[PDB]
Design a protein around this ligand. Sequence first.
Ligand SMILES: OC[C@H]1O[C@H](O)[C@@H](O)[C@@H](O)[C@@H]1O
Length: 281
Amino acid sequence: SRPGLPVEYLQVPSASMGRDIKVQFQGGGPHAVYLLDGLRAQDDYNGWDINTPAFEEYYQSGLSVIMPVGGQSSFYTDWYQPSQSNGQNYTYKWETFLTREMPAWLQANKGVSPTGNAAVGLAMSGGSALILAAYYPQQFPYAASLSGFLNPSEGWWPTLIGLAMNDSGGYNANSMWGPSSDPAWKRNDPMVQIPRLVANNTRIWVYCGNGTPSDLGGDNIPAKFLEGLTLRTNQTFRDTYAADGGRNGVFNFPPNGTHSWPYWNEQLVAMKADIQHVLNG
Ligand SMILES: OC[C@H]1O[C@H](O)[C@@H](O)[C@@H](O)[C@@H]1O
């Protein structure tokens, strides 16, 4: 990162996962932007730090920046069981980590507020961000989804998500939310949870690109299909939000936008003033 940036790397114990979770962190205010990674999340650095100047862009913004590290194919959710076939030796509990363990550690050690924050996700974690806002409104009054999979329980989505998770580290969607008919699928479906976002008055920022090249993952899915379905589902989400009385959203579907880190970063920059005004202001 740019010289002079007070960027830290932390080891935050997760009791629920029985291991330490690495977290990249920049201070600068009591409230924070949680920057969530995609399907191919690595164990060294969060994709936002690898691919974008996020820390530099939010330096001296009055907001802290939190980039959890790890959780390949996790959907930032609490799984039913260890991923069956790839030999995972514990159960992912990333919702517990993000909503309890991590904010408790950051509050106790640094004074970061557990409440009044923003969740910003892309691709895999676009839906995660909205789900976090749906069920933890005090923690996340603001959520952004950038090229997110916003109707994971519908139609071919469980199949596509299963394919993409397998293509990213051999993870099993069935171990995560059960068979596609299990209640966990709808529970974690932003489209289904729109009325929670409306009643919570969540400030939502929803971007979606189209075409190629793509950083969505799921490269094992026939060319162009995931990229187009992601757009169509985002458009349906947009229409449904309005139909359900939603009145606190920004929807950015620029025709030249792609599902790629450069556009996701452009959106992160574009929403900065928006987050500042909503969270601080
Ligand atoms: O996400 C934050 C959670 O953990 C914090 O430690 C609690 O103080 C509370 O603010 C919340 O239950």
